[PDB]
Amino acid sequence: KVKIAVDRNPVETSFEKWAKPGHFSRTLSKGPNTTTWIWNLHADAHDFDSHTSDLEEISRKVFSAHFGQLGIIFIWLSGMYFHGARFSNYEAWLSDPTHIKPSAQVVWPIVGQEILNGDVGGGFQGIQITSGFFQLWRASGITSELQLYTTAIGGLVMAAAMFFAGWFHYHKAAPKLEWFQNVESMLNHHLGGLLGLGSLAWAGHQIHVSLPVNKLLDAGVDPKEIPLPHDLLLNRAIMADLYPSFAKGIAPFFTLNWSEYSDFLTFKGGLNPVTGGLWLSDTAHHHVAIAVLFLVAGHMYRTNWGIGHSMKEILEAHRGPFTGEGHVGLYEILTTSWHAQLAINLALFGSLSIIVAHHMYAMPPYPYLATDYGTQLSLFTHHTWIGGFCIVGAGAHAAIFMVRDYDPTNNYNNLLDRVIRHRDAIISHLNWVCIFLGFHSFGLYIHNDTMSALGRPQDMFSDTAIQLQPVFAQWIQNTHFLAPQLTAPNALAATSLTWGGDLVAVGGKVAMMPISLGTSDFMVHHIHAFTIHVTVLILLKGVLFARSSRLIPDKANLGFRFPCDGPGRGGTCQVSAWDHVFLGLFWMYNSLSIVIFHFSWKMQSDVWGTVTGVSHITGGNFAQSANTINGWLRDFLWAQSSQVIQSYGSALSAYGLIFLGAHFVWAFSLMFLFSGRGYWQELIESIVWAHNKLKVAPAIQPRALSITQGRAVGVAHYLLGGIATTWSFFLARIISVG
Template identity: 75%
Template sequence: MIIRSPEPEVKILVDRDPVKTFFEEWARPGHFSRTIAKGPDTTTWIWNLHADAHDFDSHTSDLEEISRKIFSAHFSQLSIIFLWLSGMYFHGARFSNYEAWLSDPTHIGPSAQVVWPIVGQEILNGDIWRASGITSELQIYCTAIGALVFAALMLFSVHVSLPINQFLNAGVDPKEIPLPHEFILNRDLLAQLYPSFTEGATPFFTLNWSKYAEFLTFRGGLDPVTGGLWLTDIAHHHLAIVILFLIAGHMYKTNWGIGHSLKDILEAHKAHHMYSMPAYPYLATDYGTQLSLFTHHMWIGGFLIVGAAAHAAIFMVRDYDPTTRYNDLLDRVLRHRDAIISHLNWVCIFLGFHSFGLYIHNDTMSALGRPQDMFSDTAIQLQPVFAQWIQNTHTLAPGATAPGATASTSLTWAGGDLVAVGGKVALLPIPLGTLDFLVHHIHAFAIHVTVLILLKGVLFARSSRLIPDKANLSFRFPCDGPGRGGTCQVSAWDHVFLGLFWMYNSISVVIFHFSWKIQSDVWGTISDQGVSSITINGWLCDFLWAQASQVIQSYGSSLSVYGLLFLGAHFVWAFSLMFLLSGRGYWQELIESIVWAHNKLKVAPTTQPRALSIVQGRAVGVTHYLLGGIATTWAFFLARIIAVG
């Protein structure tokens, strides 16, 4: 006889609408905080609006309400993205020369609008639209109106993109090609191009998958007509990814930090894959788009990595409970934090002295007129033998590991053939030499310093020998009081702040390296990079100064908008130094003297002026520093590449 204890009855309560909300509430500044909602006493109120809008813990302790806010924020963001994309599609339909470009992509330059006489400057979508199977501006209008509901239908690669692109590649006039919905609704149309379509899903369920080899290929390399990956390869790849992710989705779950970090790693890979394996037709010969895509995804990857560190630090301060986490993996990492950080510190010092030491040696030998004593491919060689071995392995892979493939995964591996479309180089093998060895060690140095700062912020977020009770001071705090001299820039937020600058350094070196190397080694528009870039002087003279000539001299040309952006972004960047290089007390005294003058004239406002807090000043400073630096680089790159590419 088995005796069971009676199961407890659970009473489930469902809130119908626990929080009534209305637009008047949302229109009131600071409605989320009782203190801020009272209105401004001092100018700090404006900054608190920015700082605390997303600090849901300070608004309410109701977990359900916090979850609801986060959930609604996701949908708000999605709606903004859809609106933005819809606008881009409408812009392309109304103002671009898409149909003209589609009829002759190798000779007609794409243009986003009819206002500015600039060819080659577009909103970077023609390649994507062609890959989607869009053949007229009317279809772009429909996509814009449907705000991507229709786009999801049109991007169905097997039924729409493959047949339409097969016709386009064969030189069929876009006007003669059946409309996308006809390929979806009429199977006979597809069967004319791909006979196995007549058998439907039977080969799939009978495991006779080779029948689908007509439109799910494994060729490798690039389509010689468009300079992009074979769309049949892409369709096959996406189908395989779906199957893998269906399985993997059940296997892997993550709680915090690492899930975000995987996204960052993928984002940085994306930047490299966009040029080494161009997925869209004619993308590889659109040099401005290629350079922009690489730069864009590198910046995104950098911000996501810093974001991952910020969230890990917030977790440590807000959610970590040392009483329940005894001797688990994180606890053991925290107990070893001194060893981890001191080792990273040593690695950074070693990398810094040695990587820059090689450059300083080269600059010195160059200045003394002793080229035979420099580190270069023609004197003292430092060949990246491991990277060359990896390149060679990938070159040999098609014959060894994938007998069905006719080319390796990317033409950038050694040993492939040049692919040119309409007389422009799309891609060719990219050899590595002494220059790459030198620059990649600079990359390693900058990345390790970024990791050192961010990881120290996470591991010392709750306590340190200097401030044992740091956990009580929250995520961000200033130098906190008279008894604690020398405790500035120790909060977890300050580590994120400092890490952002090193992330900026890291990504800048990467995108400069890419820009110069792909121009000299692949697109062939300037002198050989391997000669100049082994010295710091070469980087300053032959890259930054020489290539800036286009943007500096752009004022009277169709590139003038980039000249203005270049100038304006420099001002934004310089503005940041006002916040970063002067102390809060200086500004408070300055403001108080201005208040005195207002009082003398009896025009003083009721809201009392205050200088920014230390944390606020740093936030404003780093924001303008990054925004100004990124926009300056953007204008510099695009003016250069549109002029020469």
């Protein structure tokens, strides 16, 4: 029986507990005695499992927390639309997209920072933005600043509604645990209503607003002269002027004569040649199909009527001879443990963000996006980073489940148990394959460096010496390019230019050309495979040995996050799963930095550039230079760092400042990573003496940071430094040569 269940007025709305720091924890509510308390107060603020044992109260807390997050995001979107309406050059950009740089941030004229307002065109001065909002807004059919302003007000109103919803569903009407545990109903409603009705309503907006406005914009008529969207809904004669299908109305829909809707529901493929983006008619058909698919998918699970599947029954039905009880117990795990759910959802959400990065570079969905090289680099890089972070988080919360929620007396000879029971075999095989990948992938680079240094280029791994061609990827590429002729007859062109074919250019710049894969591409892909496998090794080892190992047989009783178990047994520093997340974070940084470097150099070398033949940004040096480390060091980092290092005295000077600042923060992290808190505690003792001598010793006792906090501060400043460094490099480079 699926129904609404709610408790009335559980928690009174009062400012009392705001005035009592650490009220949520019985330990921290005693007050502060040393400085450690403060850090604890912020570290355990949102760890709701350590607050209460009651799953209902925890579930309510996470629900209202999620509402808070959504309100914050709505404030953020409201801000972006408002700054796009009031402090931007969006209309001028609409009138000339190929020669006006998108800018939506202006600085005030104080202390000389006014220089950051550069000549972006359109009679405007500001910082060129690379988020891609202008291309998104043109694709949505927005033409005036007024519509953006109204969207800003709407998003602010929605943020107020989200914070009211949070307060309401925590303090006034807070859902019960059996409401939260209706996962079959939740899947039905989210697959139908969210994804399904989302893409249906978006396809509605596209077909009714986007297609005509962008068809006129591609035709060339002045945006102010283009009819307003409500007129397009009101007078169907205009819709029939652009696409005659609309003359017949919704009669071909209900009579199943859908072929007459071919004017705006197409299957062209490729890119719009005058605009460099995917066809909005293809995107409209795509969202209609997606809508129908998800609405079909959302009627699968049984709720209040006999029809529908049962999650526990589908899980308990798939059992084989090799796995024993199979998927028995997993339903119970995934309907009582928030951390298991968070692990799964983070893994797929991160992976999905990486897929978003690749598919959005390869098949540019917004108009005048592919030739906004800065926007393309920024979007790819950004979503790749977000992805990687969410994957590391997935490993983290998997381990947190393994320590806090795992209970084998409901989980006995099961998939999870067998994984735990042959973890040594798993980790040893992963270990070997990581060493193998490392040796042969990195060893080719070291081999090439040595041969190149010794004056023997004929002994290198390259396209002219000993070739290592990516035959499989080339075959898949060729197949994908030849697909419209045989295996996808209704396709006018391939889904992406990178498979092969011609060349689409907009405003003299290359939007997309065919990407060729050679020995250097082989080598970087196996580097990627190596780094990903190592990251998986660390995280998976962390989750499999979170409970016990031959070294620490009772590791589970020590918790998820703990420094060690002492210098005995040879030394047990960093045995915790938290410390495995810490190392996985460093390795994730390594992997994704080489990934975004691959993308940057490959695009600037073999894809981007001006059309006269195509003159690429770096002349095509990738195929011969990307086989040695010296080649990456000289032709990529050193060569392309010119723009960032000589950005002083111009509008890009902030990128030089943040280059230096990021280098500094990265280095600053090394003190925390390389040192230990005993030294710092003793130093603080001497300083405390000095303060005592002058009667200024605080009542809250100065303590060195904990071992785990030293590691956390270390990795956070390390990531911030490195990532911000590559950020400044990338943005200064691509804005100056773009």
